[PDB]
């Protein structure tokens, strides 16, 4: 019927002045654009069909052609930036927002989808969607006593589109748009659907990826305990954005970091720091490095939760970029911690895997490790036990690597090495 039409035939029907002929041709374009194997988006654009699709969005008395056009335009908007731009240039943004209030749920859902693709292109189209007034009708679709009464596919599309309005930087979304979206987002973050939960966490991870003021807007809505709960989910599509959000929050102030600790997040990190998915381990270790950059009472909580052995573990064996986050974790720890906390680090076995990483060719991890060694020696000087640390570094081959780095291209790997040799190995 409408399967495998030529673009020429589609143009012919759409250019007829017969609404039923145009409906059939539009559905045929929708089916062409729905195939996974290179949908001919550019050929449809080059045929000049986008203005006609957009005008069909307004045919209130022919809801089928509204749906088919909406679907066709959604899939053009799903392509490259240039292809999304063609949809925007055709006037689709206000026409889709007008469809949000359609009495046909499948048509308003398709308008939700299309705006999600347009907003997802980048911050400019995101902010342009916001300026046309998309947020109010979107949130009104979710203004129900219980989200569970909404169709699951519909709720997932609404959640995903809302998270694209939260997405991207330079610039971040407008402050007032974020404040307007946040209470609905908090409610979606407590819903029981795994996809809604994943996309809600993604939205929160975008909003917390910024300055401390952006983090605070989220943290003050009280979502940190729910994020920590989702941190323990069995669904990796949920854990990944939940962890990104938690890690984003601990890039903020010590007070914002403390609320992550208060919420019980550190008890999940034995699993996260041994998680089979290397990017979970990397993100978890980066998060740990920002926690060990906090106060001494926050370092103490890391100790209390038994997490220093887990840092020794990832330093000993992990993907290199995780090992580098672990190196940062130790340097931050030794920079801010007490003498007793630093001594405990040595007792857990940090020295030998620390020395082994001086073999790496990454020059700034060598700088990071050399700073941690200097920090630990400074703690050992306060105790009069510099020589035991010297011999410890000696027996694991660490001294050989320190004096090897005396022969290094970088000017500070140069001097840090010789300085440590000068003062502690004479």
């Amino acid at each position: 019927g409408t399967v495998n039409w030529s673009v020429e035939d589609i143009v012919k029907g759409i250019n007829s002045n017969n609404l039923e002929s145009q409906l059939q041709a539009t559905q045929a374009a929708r089916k062409l654009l729905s195939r996974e194997k290179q949908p001919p988006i550019d050929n449809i654009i080059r045929a000049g069909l986008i203005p006609k699709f957009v005008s069909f969005l307004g045919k209130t008395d022919c809801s089928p052609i509204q749906f088919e056009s909406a679907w066709a335009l959604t899939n053009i908007a799903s392509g490259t930036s240039e292809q999304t731009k063609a949809v925007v240039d055709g006037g689709a943004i206000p026409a889709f927002i007008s469809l949000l209030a359609s009495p046909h749920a499948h048509i308003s859902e398709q308008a939700v989808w299309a705006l999600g693709n347009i907003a997802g292109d980048g911050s400019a189209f995101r902010d342009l969607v916001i300026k046309h007034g998309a947020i109010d009708p979107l949130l009104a679709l979710l203004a129900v006593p219980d989200l569970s009464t909404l169709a699951c596919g519909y709720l997932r599309n609404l959640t995903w589109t809302l998270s694209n309005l939260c997405r991207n930087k330079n610039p971040a979304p407008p402050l007032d748009a974020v404040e307007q979206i946040l209470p609905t987002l908090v409610r979606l973050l407590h819903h029981n659907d795994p996809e809604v939960l994943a996309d809600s966490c993604w939205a929160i991870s975008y909003l917390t990826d910024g300055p401390n003021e952006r983090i605070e807007m989220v943290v003050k809505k009280g979502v940190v305990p729910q994020l920590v709960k989702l941190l323990g989910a069995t669904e990796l599509p949920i854990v990944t954005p939940a962890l990104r959000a938690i890690g984003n929050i601990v890039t903020g102030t010590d007070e914002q970091t403390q609320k992550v600790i208060d919420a019980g997040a550190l008890a999940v990190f034995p699993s996260l720091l041994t998680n089979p998915k290397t990017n979970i381990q990397k993100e978890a270790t980066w998060t740990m490095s920002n926690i060990t950059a906090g106060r001494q009472d926050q370092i103490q909580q890391v100790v209390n939760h038994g997490l220093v052995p887990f840092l020794v573990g990832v330093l000993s064996k992990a993907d290199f970029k995780t090992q580098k986050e672990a190196a940062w974790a130790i340097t931050n720890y030794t920079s801010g911690g007490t003498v007793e906390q630093i001594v405990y680090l040595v007792h857990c076995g940090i020295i030998e895997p620390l020395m082994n990483l001086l073999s790496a060719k990454d020059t700034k991890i060598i700088q990071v490790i050399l700073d941690a060694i200097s920090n630990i020696f400074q703690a050992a000087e306060k105790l009069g036990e510099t020589e035991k640390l010297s011999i410890m570094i000696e027996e694991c081959g660490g001294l050989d690597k320190i004096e090897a780095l005396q022969r290094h291209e970088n000017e500070s790997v140069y001097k840090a090495s010789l300085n440590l040799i000068e003062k502690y190995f004479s």
């Binding site: 729905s34 195939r35 996974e36 949908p39 679907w71 959604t74 899939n75 908007a77 799903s78 392509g79 999304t84 398709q110 989808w113 999600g116 693709n117 997802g120 292109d121 995903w160 694209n164 997405r167 993604w202 954005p241």
Partner: peptide, 10 residues
């Protein structure tokens, strides 16, 4: 990598 855009197949 969470895709910003989504294509509708059916």
């Amino acid at each position: 990598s969470n895709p910003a855009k989504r294509h509708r197949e059916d």
